[PDB]
Enzyme design. Sequence first.
Site, short mmCIF file in Angstrom:
data_model
loop_
_atom_site.label_atom_id
_atom_site.label_comp_id
_atom_site.label_asym_id
_atom_site.label_seq_id
_atom_site.Cartn_x
_atom_site.Cartn_y
_atom_site.Cartn_z
CD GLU A 158 -3.31 -0.55 0.15
OE1 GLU A 158 -3.19 0.67 -0.40
OE2 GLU A 158 -4.14 -1.59 -0.19
CG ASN A 183 -8.85 7.43 -4.28
OD1 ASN A 183 -8.09 6.78 -4.76
ND2 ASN A 183 -9.06 7.56 -2.99
CG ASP A 216 -14.25 8.73 -4.93
OD1 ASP A 216 -12.83 9.36 -4.51
OD2 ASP A 216 -14.21 7.84 -4.42
CB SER A 229 -11.91 9.67 -1.32
OG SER A 229 -11.56 8.66 -2.30
CG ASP A 251 -6.79 5.80 -0.92
OD1 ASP A 251 -7.95 5.80 -0.21
OD2 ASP A 251 -6.84 5.40 -1.75
CG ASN A 296 -11.32 6.38 0.52
OD1 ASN A 296 -10.88 6.76 -0.18
ND2 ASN A 296 -12.65 6.46 0.82
C1 LIG Z 1 -8.13 0.90 3.56
C2 LIG Z 1 -9.44 1.60 3.07
O1 LIG Z 1 -9.72 2.86 3.56
N1 LIG Z 1 -10.04 1.05 2.09
C3 LIG Z 1 -11.31 1.52 1.32
C4 LIG Z 1 -12.48 0.60 1.59
O2 LIG Z 1 -12.85 0.54 2.76
C5 LIG Z 1 -13.64 1.47 0.87
O3 LIG Z 1 -14.50 0.10 0.78
C6 LIG Z 1 -15.98 0.27 1.06
O4 LIG Z 1 -16.05 0.01 2.51
C7 LIG Z 1 -17.44 0.15 3.05
C8 LIG Z 1 -17.17 0.10 4.44
O5 LIG Z 1 -16.49 -0.99 4.95
C9 LIG Z 1 -18.12 -0.93 2.28
O6 LIG Z 1 -19.33 -0.74 2.89
C10 LIG Z 1 -20.14 -1.99 3.31
O7 LIG Z 1 -20.65 -2.66 1.99
C11 LIG Z 1 -21.67 -3.87 2.09
C12 LIG Z 1 -21.93 -4.26 0.73
O8 LIG Z 1 -20.87 -4.48 -0.05
C13 LIG Z 1 -22.91 -3.25 2.92
O9 LIG Z 1 -23.87 -4.25 3.18
C14 LIG Z 1 -22.36 -2.80 4.34
O10 LIG Z 1 -23.64 -2.42 5.12
C15 LIG Z 1 -21.37 -1.73 4.14
N2 LIG Z 1 -20.63 -1.45 5.28
C16 LIG Z 1 -20.87 -0.38 5.94
C17 LIG Z 1 -19.90 -0.06 7.28
O11 LIG Z 1 -21.28 0.49 5.81
C18 LIG Z 1 -18.38 -0.87 0.92
O12 LIG Z 1 -18.89 -1.63 0.12
C19 LIG Z 1 -16.85 -0.67 0.31
N3 LIG Z 1 -16.86 -0.44 -1.17
C20 LIG Z 1 -16.16 -0.96 -2.00
C21 LIG Z 1 -16.27 -0.84 -3.47
O13 LIG Z 1 -15.36 -2.17 -1.87
C22 LIG Z 1 -13.25 1.41 -0.79
C23 LIG Z 1 -14.08 2.35 -1.59
O14 LIG Z 1 -14.83 3.46 -1.09
O15 LIG Z 1 -12.01 2.62 -0.43
C24 LIG Z 1 -11.20 2.00 -0.08
O16 LIG Z 1 -9.98 2.78 -0.11
#
Ligand SMILES: CC(=O)N[C@@H]1[C@@H](O)[C@H](O[C@@H]2O[C@H](CO)[C@@H](O[C@@H]3O[C@H](CO)[C@@H](O)[C@H](O)[C@H]3NC(C)=O)[C@H](O)[C@H]2NC(C)=O)[C@@H](CO)O[C@H]1O
Length: 129
Positions: free
Chosen positions: A35, A46, A48, A50, A52, A59
């Site tokens: 990373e 990024n 969008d 945001s 990292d 993020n």
């Molecule tokens: C290290 C870092 O910051 N990584 C970032 C990722 O965490 C982020 O991923 C998104 O994270 C959220 C929260 O964990 C995910 O939400 C969950 O998604 C499921 C369905 O997939 C849903 O049912 C859950 O309720 C929801 N959790 C919460 C706590 O709300 C979300 O899906 C992730 N999205 C993706 C594409 O992986 C990503 C993208 O914003 O960024 C990384 O940098």
Amino acid sequence: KVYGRCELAAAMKRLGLDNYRGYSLGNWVCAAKFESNFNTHATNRNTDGSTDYGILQINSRWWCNDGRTPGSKNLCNIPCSALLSSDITASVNCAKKIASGGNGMNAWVAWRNRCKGTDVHAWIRGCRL
Ligand SMILES: CC(=O)N[C@@H]1[C@@H](O)[C@H](O[C@@H]2O[C@H](CO)[C@@H](O[C@@H]3O[C@H](CO)[C@@H](O)[C@H](O)[C@H]3NC(C)=O)[C@H](O)[C@H]2NC(C)=O)[C@@H](CO)O[C@H]1O
């Protein structure tokens, strides 16, 4: 600060990351290597809006607040600048929260592409912990 591999492993071990949610310590050392190359100051912006931040590239749309990301959820309840410290405590405490999601460590794209599935125990061998 750029951490040495074994130096980082030890810092992470004392903060409770060995076998956190099943994941052995080398998972976290391998995630930080791909990373940020162990650099606490790494940042990647990024398209969008945001960014990292830090050694584990946390993020700002979901986890920390930097003031400039539309819709930040700030789920770790921290300023993103706290993640750029040579002290990794704030990064590890947030990372524990991230890893507790259903997706576990798959939230780290570099860990899923270059670490997941391999013998990640290699990342802490030679470190006498
Ligand atoms: C290290 C870092 O910051 N990584 C970032 C990722 O965490 C982020 O991923 C998104 O994270 C959220 C929260 O964990 C995910 O939400 C969950 O998604 C499921 C369905 O997939 C849903 O049912 C859950 O309720 C929801 N959790 C919460 C706590 O709300 C979300 O899906 C992730 N999205 C993706 C594409 O992986 C990503 C993208 O914003 O960024 C990384 O940098």
